[PDB]
Amino acid sequence: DHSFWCHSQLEVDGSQHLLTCAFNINTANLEFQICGALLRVKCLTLNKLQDIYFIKTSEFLLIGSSNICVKLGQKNLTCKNMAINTIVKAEAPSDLKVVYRKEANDFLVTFNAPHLKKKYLKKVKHDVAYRPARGESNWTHVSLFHTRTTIPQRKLRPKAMYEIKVRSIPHNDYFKGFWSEWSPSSTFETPEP
Amino acid sequence: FSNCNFTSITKIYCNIIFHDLTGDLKGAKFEQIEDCESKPACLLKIEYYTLNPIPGCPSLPDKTFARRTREALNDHCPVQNICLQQTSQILRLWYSFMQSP
Amino acid sequence: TVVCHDLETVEVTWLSLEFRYGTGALQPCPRYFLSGTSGCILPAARAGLLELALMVFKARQRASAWLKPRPPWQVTLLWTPDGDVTVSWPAHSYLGLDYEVQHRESNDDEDAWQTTSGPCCDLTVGGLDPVRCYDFRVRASPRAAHYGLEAQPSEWTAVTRLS
């Protein structure tokens, strides 16, 4: 099986878009080529970096499907058809912060949603996950479309350290794709009751 | 253009071409000349303004918003001041497209 | 200033005003705003270009270019078993609106409003505490790509309190 995955990311370091692909081994003389649904060119060849392949470009039409092919000289080993606009990986949120509010007896969780400042995919659904840092527990998840939420004190054990993190996924009637990477985990402590 | 998939074209416009158009205009605005009262009729005008070059802005059909417009129609239909002026005209026909039955 | 109220009327505020739709004959304001002129109200047409002449002032746009919708008529709040709150409202009689739903803890400030957006005619607000009280308010916001950048959102609805 020479199966592979790809995801796109819109407006990474400017107006340019990022395409990333990688194999599910050895990259012996193997190259990735994308053809179709580009603005000024017929095809592009991705740039190899360690175990992954990527291209940063302004050439994506974001309309229609492309053929992504693993090639050796000119032989197609495997080709898959996919639309750049349907494999969009969201950017992870940042500046995750937790503040204990004694008067409200709760924890205020905040983070920044980078898509808000972007042009094409501005709206994502967020997934905040938290659990005690020590021991085995099922993560509690909270689904949001906004960038603050609260956790009631009573919902948590007292005098314990919690781990918390957040991720995002596209929420758009045209752009579709994948969960972002998790943000870095923050930790916070609950006081005595 | 009466047989075009207007729903698909709308999604491409709303999520891409619109942003491309407003991005190029950068707040600049003018006045329109002609309007339209139906989606097929609006698409016809939009296509004409977008993909036919005009004196003073020959590169218009090669702009990103224009190429994307061309691809959307294909897929779903069976002097800097001059460039900006035309872009404003095109944008306002889209508004008419969006508001028309 | 020019405002097209809910695609029903166009209200112009500043003199004498003439107007026409299309390329027909200019017509006088049917009902001037007079002091005791300060402005004019005229009918909105869903199609055709509205030309305004106050020449001391000129404009030429679809009436919808200045769209300010009426606020949503009545907001409903329904706690779901998920722990989410579904906010819903009646649809406008025309397309091209986004709705902004704001909420905040009922004890909180006027600077503590959280916003979410979506199309008609409902959306979900998650992560709220079931034992706390929340204030909700809604306004309709014309989509830039639909009506242009000269359109503006409605006033907020009166607060609706959830327990």
C96 and C156 co-located in one domain? yes
Contact A146 C114 (CB under 8 A): yes
On whether the CB atoms of residues C137 and C156 are closer than 8 A, the answer is yes
Domain check: are C80 and C154 in the same one? Answer: yes
Residues C2 and C54 grouped into a single domain = yes
Nearest alpha carbon to residue C21 among C63, C49, C2: C49
Instruction: Show me where the domains of chain A are located.
Output: 1-89, 90-193
- Asked if the Cβ–Cβ distance from A63 to B12 is below 8 Å, we say yes
Q: Please report all neighbours of B, defined by 3+ CB atom pairs within 8 A.
A: A, C
Q: Which chains touch C (3 or more CB pairs under 8 A)?
A: A, B
Using DSSP's 3-state secondary structure scheme, residue A145 falls into coil
Q: Which residues pair with C2 in a beta bridge?
A: C12
Q: Which of A98, A109, A142, A145 to mutate to test the interface with C (most CBs of C within 10 A)?
A: A145
Q: Tell whether C10 and C75 lie within a shared domain.
A: no
Q: With beta carbons under 8 A apart, name residues in chain A contacting C126.
A: 142-145, 149
Each residue of B50-83: b (16+ CB within 10 Å) or e? beeeeeebeebeebbbbbbbbbbbeebbeeeeeb
Question: 3-state secondary structure string, B16-60?
Answer: HHHHHHHHHHCCCCCCCCCCCCCHHHHHHHHHHHHHCCECCECCH
Determine the residue of chain B that is closest to C60 in CA distance: B31
Nearest to C72 by CA among C113, C110, C117, C121: C121
* CA pair distance B29, B38, nearest whole angstrom: 24
Cβ atoms within 10 Å, residue A98: 17
Which of A148, C92, C145, A89 is CA-nearest to residue B93? C145
Residues C47, C76: one domain?
no
Task: Let me know whether C4 and C75 are in one domain.
Answer: no
CB C14 within 8 A of CB C38: yes
Q: What is the nearest CA distance from A39 to chain C, expressed in angstroms?
A: 23
How many contacts, defined by CB atoms under 8 Å, are there between B and C? 41
Residues 6+ positions from C106 with CB-CB distance below 8 Å: C132, C133, C134, C135, C161
Please give the tally of structural domains in chain C: 2
**Distance between B56 CA and the closest CA of chain C, angstroms:** 25
Residue A61 is given by DSSP the state -
Q: Which of B77, B60, B62 is nearest to B12 (CA)?
A: B77
Which chain C residues in 84-143 lie under 8 Å from chain A, judged by CB atoms?
84, 105, 107, 114-117, 123-127, 129, 131
**Is the peptide bond between A6 and the residue preceding it cis, with omega within 30 degrees of 0?**
no
Query: Measured between CA atoms, how close is B22 to chain A, in angstroms?
Result: 10
A148 and A139 in contact (C-beta within 8 Å)? Answer: no
Rounded to a whole number of angstroms, the distance from the CA of B79 to the nearest CA of chain C is 25
Look up the CATH architecture of domain A1-89. Answer: Sandwich (2.60)
Is there a contact between A145 and C125 if contact means CB atoms under 8 Å apart?
A: yes
With CB atoms and an 8 Å threshold, state whether C126 touches A144. Answer: yes
Chain B residues whose CB is inside 8 A of the C145 CB are: 13-14, 18, 94, 98
Do C159 and C118 share a structural domain?
yes
Please answer yes or no on whether C115 and A152 come within 8 Å at the CB atom.
Answer: no
Are the folds of A1-89 and A90-193 the same?
Answer: yes
User: What fold does the segment set A90-193 form as a domain?
Assistant: Immunoglobulin-like (2.60.40)
The hierarchical CATH code for the domain B1-101 is 1.20.1250.90
Angle A81-A86-A91 from CA coordinates, rounded to 5°: 130
- Helix, strand, coil in percent for chain A, rounding step 5: 5, 50, 45
Out of A61, A64, A174, closest to residue B15 by CB: A174
Q: How far is B5 from chain A (nearest CA, A)?
A: 14
Residue C31 sits in which domain range? 1-69
Where residue C121 sits, what CATH number does that domain have? 2.60.40.10
- Asked whether the beta carbons of residue A142 and residue C114 sit closer than 8 angstroms, the reply is no
In contact, B90 and B18? CB cutoff 8 Å: no
Quick one: C102 and C113 in the same domain? yes
Query: Which contiguous run of DSSP H or E holds residue C139?
Result: strand C134-142
Rounded distance between C-alpha atoms, residue A141 and residue A127, angstroms: 6
The answer for A36, left when phi > 0, alpha when psi is -120 to 50, beta otherwise, is: left
Domain boundary pick from C69, C89, C106: C69
Q: Hey, which residues does C124 pair with through a beta bridge?
A: C86
Same domain for C98 and C152, yes or no, is: yes
Q: Are residues C75 and C114 in the same domain?
A: yes
- As a whole number of angstroms, the distance between CA A103 and CA C71 comes to 35
Contact A119 B64 (CB under 8 A): no
Co-location of C48 and C82 in the same domain: no
| Method used to determine the 3D structure | X-ray
Residues of B in contact with C149 (CB under 8 A): 22
Q: What is the 3-state secondary structure (H, E, C) of C58-75?
A: EEEECHHHHEECCCCCCC
